[PDB]
Amino acid sequence: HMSIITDVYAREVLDSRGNPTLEVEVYTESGAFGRGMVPSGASTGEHEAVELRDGDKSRYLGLGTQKAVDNVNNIIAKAIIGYDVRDQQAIDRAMIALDGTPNKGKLGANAILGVSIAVARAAADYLEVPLYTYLGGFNTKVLPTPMMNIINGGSHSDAPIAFQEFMIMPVGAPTFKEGLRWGAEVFHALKKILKERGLVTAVGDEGGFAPKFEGTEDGVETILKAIEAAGYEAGENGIMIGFDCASSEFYDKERKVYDYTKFEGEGAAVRTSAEQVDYLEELVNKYPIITIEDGMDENDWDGWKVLTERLGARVQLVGDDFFVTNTEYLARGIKENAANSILIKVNQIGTLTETFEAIEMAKEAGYTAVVSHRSGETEDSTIADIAVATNAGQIKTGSLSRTDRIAKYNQLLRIEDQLGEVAQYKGIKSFYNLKK
């Protein structure tokens, strides 16, 4: 009776932006314990599982999570207490059924995920094994190649830049520990460069800069300078570059065009899907770009197909809002040859079970799974363990400042350290979707 869940308790806490979220605590009869904190996205995909907010404009601007917390304590708890802490799938399924809606809108995806994660961590604690081992079994070894959101554009930046994120990726590093150092050193060299230019070195939600660049090319060219300044190569043997275009954010839903004037000021390109592909292609041709996320709009299936046809053999194409970590959508992307990669955000779908189903479905189509943070993060580092548990090979968990990002990198350092000689780092070979 030691392994039986005796307590499931949620409380309201704050994410890395100072907005409410929640965490759940799970205890077994034996006293094994797990805590699950939930992240939150800024701009959420139209098709994401529902994150339940209170909507009370007198508390936290209506962003309270006390309703979700109540749901955990008064509904989910009664249903889950009594399960063996190790019956992850059964528990995730029970919560899905208990909610009864496809988008988890009754109990809230954040309520459900908090329990889902807390239960798993409690089970790992109960078995006295690392979380990546509990989740993945014995054959966990691959530290993920990180893509690091070093420069920001899009809505929040005031530079004339449409793309939300510009990342660097230490594909040439021998270990994760060294890749991490590479990234940090380039980050710090970038800061120095920005100061010398008289640009702002304060950071955005994910710990990167949003400097007033001349535009997209200036940003990318500035990153390459930082890379060289730090003493690294720009290419497959060193550090490569990637985008999160977040094109749904400037996709004119009515004109169904990609309106750059939105972020790059009037007189900027307005592109059709075709012209959108051409643009991305020009950039891939110009620079050492290894990956592009949401180059097309979450619902521009035709555009995705074309893009994947044109670039999918040269460049990784990651569906984020396109797939919302949902096997229903990924299964279709696969059938219709759209994208060759999926960004995995656990709170887009809401259970570890469904998250792991998405990761497995991806692998089996030859797609990479890039485990991701959200813009609103916590001190939790579960996605580091998910990345290694599944030997995913890649992770997107932020720039090299802010503990909401660094906590994941630190956890990956611990995991690499505990794995010792078994630890692997695939670098450029992470991209089995490009036959590397």
| CB-CB neighbours of 12 under 10 Å | 18
Would the annotation count 348 as a binding residue? no
d(CA 388, CA 373): 15
Is 206 assigned a catalytic role?
A: yes
d(CA 274, CA 257): 10
Cα angle vertex 106, ends 102, 108, to 5°? 90
Catalytic residue among 104, 191, 345, 408: 345
Whole-angstrom CA distances from 417 to 178, 381, 413, 414 are 12, 16, 6, 5
Element housing 411 (H / E): helix 403-419
Would the annotation count 244 as a binding residue? yes
The residue count of the chain comes to: 436
Token digits for 131?
A: 């979380």
d(CA 22, CA 41): 14
The number of angstroms, rounded, from the C-alpha of 297 to the middle of its chain's C-alpha atoms is 18
Catalytic residue among 25, 48, 206, 354: 206
Would the annotation count 66 as a binding residue? no
In the sheet that 33-37 helps form, which strands lie side by side, from edge to edge?
A: 5-14, 20-28, 33-37
d(CA 52, CA 66): 9
Would the annotation count 374 as a binding residue? yes
Would the annotation count 78 as a binding residue? no
Q: By the 8 A CB rule, do 161 and 269 touch?
A: no
Would the annotation count 320 as a binding residue? yes
| Terminal-to-terminal C-alpha distance of the chain | 49
Q: How many CA atoms lie within 13 A of 192 on its CB side?
A: 12
Number of H helices, E strands in the chain: 15, 17
**E-strand stretches of 62-113:** none
Would the annotation count 436 as a binding residue? no
Would the annotation count 185 as a binding residue? no
| Known binding-site residue numbers | 164, 244, 293, 320, 345, 374-375, 396
Q: Which residues are annotated as a binding site for (2R)-2-phosphoglycerate?
A: 164, 345, 374-375, 396
Give the residue ranges of the annotated binding site for Mg(2+): 244, 293, 320
For the annotated catalytic residues, the residue numbers are 206, 345
